[PDB]
Specification:
Chain B: Monomer. Chain B: InterPro entries: ConA-like_dom_sf (IPR013320), L-lectin (IPR016363), Lectin_legB_Mn/Ca_BS (IPR019825), Legume_lectin_dom (IPR001220), Leguminous_Lectin (IPR050258). Chain B: This is Lectin. The complex is a heterodimer of chains A (5) and B (229). Chain A has 5 residues and is mostly loops. The termini of chain A are close together. Chain B is mostly beta strands and 229 residues long. Chain B has one domain (1-229): Jelly Rolls (Sandwich). Chain B is built from 2 helices and 16 strands. Chain B has helices at 152-155, 194-197; strands at 4-7, 16-20, 23-25, 28-30, 45-50, 54-55, 59-71, 77-85, 115-120, 134-139, 146-149, 161-168, 173-179, 185-191, 201-212, 214-227. In chain B, the strands form 2 sheets. In chain B, strands 1, 3, 4, 7, 12, 13, 14 and 16 form an 8-stranded antiparallel beta sheet that branches. In chain B, strands 2, 5, 6, 8, 9, 10, 11 and 15 form an 8-stranded antiparallel beta sheet that branches. The chains are: A little secondary structure (5), B mainly beta (229). At the A-B interface, loops of A face loops of B. The complex binds 2-acetamido-2-deoxy-alpha-D-galactopyranose and calcium ion (2 copies). The site of one calcium ion has 5 residues of chain B, from strand 9.
Chain lengths: 5, 229
């Protein structure tokens, strides 16, 4: 999954 | 221009510039740092580049290196890359940017000047990469213009793997062959005019980044360029 945006 | 070098191992690290979290270790290039217990440090990037610049106008090259990925659990990140960029290129963002891009601009091809062959151990949701670990060719974007599946058997094998990267200056083609002892073989090519992207100087080297649970070690490295004349 997304982890730093 | 014409340049060649050879490191059968890295017992000497004589013309290597280290930046960020990269350092020499047990006759290798360790691209990302470890703590006092040997555990990989989260969210770091490191560069090990050959310090002498060269030019790409009217030039072909061949380079080969050996490498090991060491993982300490399931979900390692983020990988490493062999890259070409200008001589003043800084270590850029850790994580899935691989030390080669900044978040703002990482997919904008007109805001970057960097070409790489990436070994990517983490599937980034943030720019919808393909759903597997992969090897790829990057041209001014963290979104690989050409990409192929990198088998997990091989990622986690802890073998000393071999990469061959070569650029034909006449046909304007960059190509990577990657091989694993009793493992997989990988082939990628892309038409790209490196002399047009890099009209001046460049340096070649390695960028690694975490991420988590991962250390990237280069064991050997040779390079030869020659003029196409
Ligand atoms: C976010 O975290 C993971 C590790 O959990 C990876 O480092 C991934 O590449 C990171 N995201 C970005 C955008 O760097
Ligand atoms: Ca990638
Ligand atoms: Ca990734």
């Amino acid at each position: 999954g997304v982890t730093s945006a | 221009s014409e340049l060649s070098f050879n490191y059968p191992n890295f017992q000497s690290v004589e013309d290597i510039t280290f930046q960020g979290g990269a350092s020499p270790r047990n006759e290798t290039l360790q691209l990302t740092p470890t703590d006092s217990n040997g555990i990989p440090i989260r969210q770091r990037a490191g560069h090990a580049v050959y310090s002498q610049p060269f030019q790409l106008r009217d030039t072909s090259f061949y380079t080969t290196f050996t490498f090991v990925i060491r993982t300490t659990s399931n979900s390692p990140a983020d990988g490493f890359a062999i890259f070409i960029a200008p001589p003043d290129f800084p270590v850029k963002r850790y994580g899935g940017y691989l030390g080669l891009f900044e978040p703002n601009t990482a997919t904008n091809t007109s805001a970057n000047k960097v070409v790489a062959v990436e070994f990517d151990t983490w599937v980034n949701t943030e720019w919808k990469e393909p759903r597997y670990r992969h090897i790829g060719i990057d041209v001014n974007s963290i979104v690989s213009v050409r990409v192929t599946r990198w088998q997990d058997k091989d990622v986690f094998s802890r073998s000393i793997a071999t990469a061959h990267v070569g650029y034909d200056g006449i046909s304007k083609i960059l190509t990577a062959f990657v091989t694993y002892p009793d493992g997989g073989n990988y082939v990628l090519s892309h038409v790209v005019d490196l002399a047009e992207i890099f009209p001046g100087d460049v340096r070649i080297g390695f960028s690694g980044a975490t991420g988590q649970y991962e250390t990237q070690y280069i064991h050997s490295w040779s390079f030869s360029s020659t003029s196409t004349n």
